[PDB]
Amino acid sequence: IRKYKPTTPGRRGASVSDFAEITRSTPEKSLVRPLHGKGGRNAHGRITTRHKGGGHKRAYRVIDFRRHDKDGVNAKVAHIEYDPNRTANIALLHYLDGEKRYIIAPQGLKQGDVIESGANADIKPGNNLPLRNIPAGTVIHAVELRPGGGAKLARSAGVSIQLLGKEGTYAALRMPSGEIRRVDVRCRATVGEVGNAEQSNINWGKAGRMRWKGKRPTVRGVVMNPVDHPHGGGEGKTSGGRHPVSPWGKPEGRTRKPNKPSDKLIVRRRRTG
RNA sequence: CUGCUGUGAAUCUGCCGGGACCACCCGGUAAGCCUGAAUACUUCCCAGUGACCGAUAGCGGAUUAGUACCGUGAGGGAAU
RNA sequence: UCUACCCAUGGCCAGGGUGAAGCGCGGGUAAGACCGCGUGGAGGCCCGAACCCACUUAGGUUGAAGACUGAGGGGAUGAG
RNA sequence: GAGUGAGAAUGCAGGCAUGAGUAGCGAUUAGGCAAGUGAGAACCUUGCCCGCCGAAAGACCAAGGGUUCCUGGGCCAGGCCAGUCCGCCCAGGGUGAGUCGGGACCUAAGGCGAGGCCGACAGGCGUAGUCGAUGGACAACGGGUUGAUAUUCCCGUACC
RNA sequence: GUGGGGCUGCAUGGGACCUUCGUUGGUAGUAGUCAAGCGAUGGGGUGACGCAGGAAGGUAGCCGUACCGGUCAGUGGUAAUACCGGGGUAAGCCUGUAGGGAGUCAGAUAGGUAAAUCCGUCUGGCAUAUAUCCUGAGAGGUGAUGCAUAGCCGAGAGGCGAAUUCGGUGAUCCUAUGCUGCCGAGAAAAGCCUCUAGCGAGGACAUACACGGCCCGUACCCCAAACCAACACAGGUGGUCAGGUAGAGAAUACUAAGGCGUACGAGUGAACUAUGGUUAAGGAACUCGGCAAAAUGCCCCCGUAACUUCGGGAGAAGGGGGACCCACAUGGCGUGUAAGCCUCGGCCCAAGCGUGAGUGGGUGGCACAAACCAGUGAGAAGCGACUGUUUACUAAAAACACAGGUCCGUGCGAAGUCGCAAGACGAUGUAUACGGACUGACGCCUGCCCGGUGCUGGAAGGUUAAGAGGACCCG
RNA sequence: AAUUCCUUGUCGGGUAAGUUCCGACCUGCACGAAUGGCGUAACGACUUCUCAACUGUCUCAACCAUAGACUCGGCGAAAUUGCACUACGAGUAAAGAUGCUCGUUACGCGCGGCAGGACGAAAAGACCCCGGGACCUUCACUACAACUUGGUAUUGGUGC
RNA sequence: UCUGAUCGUAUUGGGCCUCUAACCUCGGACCGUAUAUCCGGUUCAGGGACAGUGCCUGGUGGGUAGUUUAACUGGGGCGG
RNA sequence: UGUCGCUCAACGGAUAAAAGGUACCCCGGGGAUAACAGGCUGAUCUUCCCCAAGAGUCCAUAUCGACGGGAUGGUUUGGCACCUCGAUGUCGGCUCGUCGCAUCCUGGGGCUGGAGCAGGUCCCAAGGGUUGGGCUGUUCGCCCAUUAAAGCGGCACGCG
């Protein structure tokens, strides 16, 4: 966190991430694939996700999330690199082999330090392992849901899963959301808590700083017309005049997995508060 | 009589119809396939006909006519 | 092909102020914290042309124009 | 036997009156004289003055237009007036590339999409591919001529 | 159940018999294999990218000038000591300057879907050199004994045609996709070079000569009477050049190059309307309302209040000087030649050429930012935090949005949405994330109520559909 | 009070005078806490009020110049239109008279100006009522999309 | 055989448990395929008679559609 | 054949089954029907009387005149719906006015509870005059300075 001095009215309550730990300004030519911003529109071209205006263009920087091969092959990080489309800095592994890859870069991962994938890995911050090998209680991330499928949980900034007791074939992983979902064991995970927890203390300061970042203005529901939202016109400031409701009339309740889904693994859901 | 979804048999003392349904009599032989004429129609061509029009009529169009023009476009659409 | 938003790829923004972080020096101290000085040139910063709008007023009001013209007006490195 | 009788439907098509020989004649630059051409001159042709634009009202392109360019001719149509003039009318001519802007080189967004999947049917998506510059790669400059073309023709020197 | 006795059986660590592996002895550096070159449709590098902003080097232009050609512009003065016009020339080819960037050689490895001498990666070695390589504005030479051009001539065409140095100023253009920052993290693919796979007995290079070079666009307009506007329409239209003198400037005033006088005129002091001008005395009395005008306005010094989120407010407010000539001044500053020194070199550098700012003395006017251009200021309240957005064509705001806040949903081909579905967006994202709802920075806060209506959970009761179940009844 | 009808509430300040403005009182018809409450530096072509300077806004208008207007020459429309050698008064009338009544005034035809009337032109009233549409809303009615419940088919063995 | 407690053999339903063979997997690896995150196939690893999709059936359902929403009335509305 | 099932009560009963908004509105109509003006009326309003109970030390009448009665005007709120809905533009202000007298000033007079100056009231009289500001969109009104005075009204609440 670094607070901008309140010089102009848009940098008053602003802050910008230090970006500390970033060894290199530019990503490797070999790994940075390209992705055009889609606009919030599917193949029919219609506004499908709303509020997704064009934002500075980005380049993809392939992280692989599986790392099944070369478990024994040690690695060393070379650089921690900034990534646009994560909420993270991404570490760059050179293997002994010399192939170059990208990791979502946990905390305490200095530049230079030796990590190792595979089954006889030591439990260090940074390295892959199945859930078979990890001692219960340690903080793991990336984990995944289905074996070989690749990392699909705890990928965000400073956000990590705690592995409670595995009991045979299933391991009870208690999510960042406090939800307790039993993955199977032969899935992998990456030991360590994910880096860059300093963000979300960022205020984006001014209005257009969240536009560069790709987000368009959100007209809230009341101001529109009766045609145009359930919270229609009225004559003055309407509260909504009805129970609060998605712009397509769907009630603001539930919306979780429909009944009869494959929720066998979910042994306890998150909480309201 | 016919579609979809379930159930689902019998071959002649069988089976189906005779306006719910049952009994007797009547009729017919399903779950297989073709089948001409009688009938409808007129882009085109021929031969005619008119108590049909005669150039604001008769086709939008007797004259460069779906032309000029109008319109992004579909489309509209003259006059002599 | 107008206009509303979005995607890809280009191009434009005369000129003049202001002086943030960082950096370098000096004071300070135990190091500090901090305080002056230079550098540096940030900003949905400032003044103002192109350019984009259209606030006020006058005209026009069978207009020069089926929405413009003149004097002023706002933005003008950015949500352009 | 009737498409059978109009004065009126803010009725339709053509024609023509009233307003009326009225209002206008489209800027913020401005014209004058001399001489000519001609039946005819405020406007056309030339000279001398005067004024206007000069980050344009100058010079070059894209797009779009279509011969409007040049030469000769014309002045019943048009030009908000007249016209000998014209961006108008007629007839003939004029547009020359290894290097410029493109294609034969390449892809972005996106379009189409073999098969394929989905779909009662029509069709909806999409993989390989294959198109798509507003971008990338690629070899040329200076002068001269025509009544009209010039990095195109020619001259001098180059490069792929 | 309690400890010590057991054989044997199972289980464990270690060396040895065979096997297998390791090692040297003759052969077998021979039967074996690669080695000219084109080298991929394959591999790898490169192509390969953002925004802001100086600083330096240049250069284009421009202004002067040595020098060349010329004029007497019927006036008071000026014969060349004044004035007018010249004072040019490109791509390429040489050199490799300023600037900018780079360690190189060997060995090992299968990581790059097969193979690699390439690319990675790890080891060592010698290196930090103004070395070498790469890139590269510009200067210089050549291109150019040509082409050009001021003028000269007779007379539309022809020919002749001198000098062609030096400074200064200065780009938004070039170096430059460079460099330093910064967060918002900035297309791919052909091309180019290399690597082997594979082709291969021919093939590469140099010099010369002779050749081939395809298709379309090419006129003319192009900020317009030729395009879109029904019109020879006061509107709209993207890019490239960017002269001078003042000026900070592409503002504006005049003006060069070049183009226009653009298509109803002649008049005439009517009223009145439109656009301009000026006004005694008063100065908002006008009026819905200081609307419209008028005023202020530039540069440098002095000066600055409450309040404050400590950044501002602020150019607050208010005030002074500004012209021309001369003196310090042959001074300074910039640039830099010849000479001077040192080791496409560097330093200073008389002169020249340019240019402030200030003190001092004057001079003149009514007026010295003299024209054009060019803030009105202050105090208070309401709403909105702000910069933005909006009803094209009567509403620009207090409305929208916003940064920030809370809640609800969402565990992942998620929720949500578009589609009949597959499929896609969300997102090549993973609860510090996405979606929805409200509020709208900041500061201090956000009280009570779950009865109604919703939402979330719970099945103990009542009440409830199809499906099974066919008593009794009827034909 | 962007909410307060009564209400120009009452008191205080500014003004010579203040239905607007600023501070306060509380009897809030009918403020009130994320449809947020109260504040608030900076910011506003926002709304309201006061002042300084300055002015034709005014007291109270004047003069000058352009472009129209006016005159002569050229081309030359338009909306409107039952007529026509289309006076005024007091009346009368579908209740506001150029046309009817009784009187009064007034030669014929133009031109430049001003706008009282022609219930002036334009737009088959935007208000109001009747009829019909539209679109929007909801505990109006009736359906449907979508979501969800159970059966049964796809669809089976095993044990309790 | 009865007023009724009961097993064992079939049928017939309800519930739960697990299994794998239907089916499902946007979970992997190979093949079509030189190219290919589509699709198809083989196999592994999982779910698993559940889900999904038919047919039947009850709910919620301004999300959406079609329409109704009286007349008298000293103009309508409110009242009656 | 006999009877039964409907606040079908909007009771001759449009369906077994149905509520609102529109200032975002639209279309067909209507002066059958409202708004603004005009017209009839005159409840109300305004001006003026008739009677005289009383107040006025006495005295009804100098001046007020209750309780009652009768009218004028057509200016207030109206009542009616006759003109106009195939269009009669609204309040204020400004500019320009013209008329009435039921006179605010000036002029002439009668009576006084008129000593004088100044008043009151009535009668005659419309020639001219009848201010400028503050607040309000304001008409009205309050106010501040004056004045001889700061008139009342009509004319589509005169005049777009």
Cβ atoms of residues A123 and A117 within 8 Å: no
Among A147, A146, A182, residue whose Cα is nearest residue A161: A182
Of A113, A142, A157, the last residue of a domain is A113
**A17 and A93 part of one domain:** yes
3-state helix, strand, coil in chain A (%, to 5): 5, 25, 75
Instruction: Provide the domain count of chain A.
Output: 3
Q: Whole-angstrom Cα distance, residue A74 to residue A95?
A: 6
Other Cβ atoms less than 10 A from the Cβ of A125: the count is: 20
Does residue A11 sit in the same domain as residue A74?
yes
Asked whether strand G has any atom less than 7 Å from the CB of A253, the reply is no
User: How does strand A2-3 pair with strand A15-16?
Assistant: antiparallel
What Cα–Cα distance (Å) separates residue A37 from each residue in A26, A66, A135, A216? 20, 25, 41, 13
Shortest-distance nucleotide from A42 CA to C1': E425
CATH number of A230's domain: 4.10.950.10
Q: Which of A194, A215, A242 is the last residue of a domain?
A: A194
Distance CA A257, CA A273 (A): 20
Q: Which of A90, A113, A136 is the last residue of a domain?
A: A113
Residue pair A21/A197 in contact by the 8 Å Cβ criterion:
no
d(CA A188, CA A66): 8
Regarding whether A168 and A108 lie in a shared domain, the answer is no
- Using the CB atom, is residue A130 less than 7 Å from strand G? no
Method by which this entry was solved: cryo-EM
- Kindly determine whether the C-beta of residue A46 is less than 7 Å away from any atom of nucleic acid strand D: no
Q: Which structural domain range is residue A52 located in?
A: 1-113
Distance of CA A89 to the CA centre of its chain: 11
- Where do we find the tokens 């009766």? A226
Same domain assignment for residues A128 and A67: no
CATH of the domain at A94: 2.40.50.140
* A93 and A2 housed in the same domain: yes
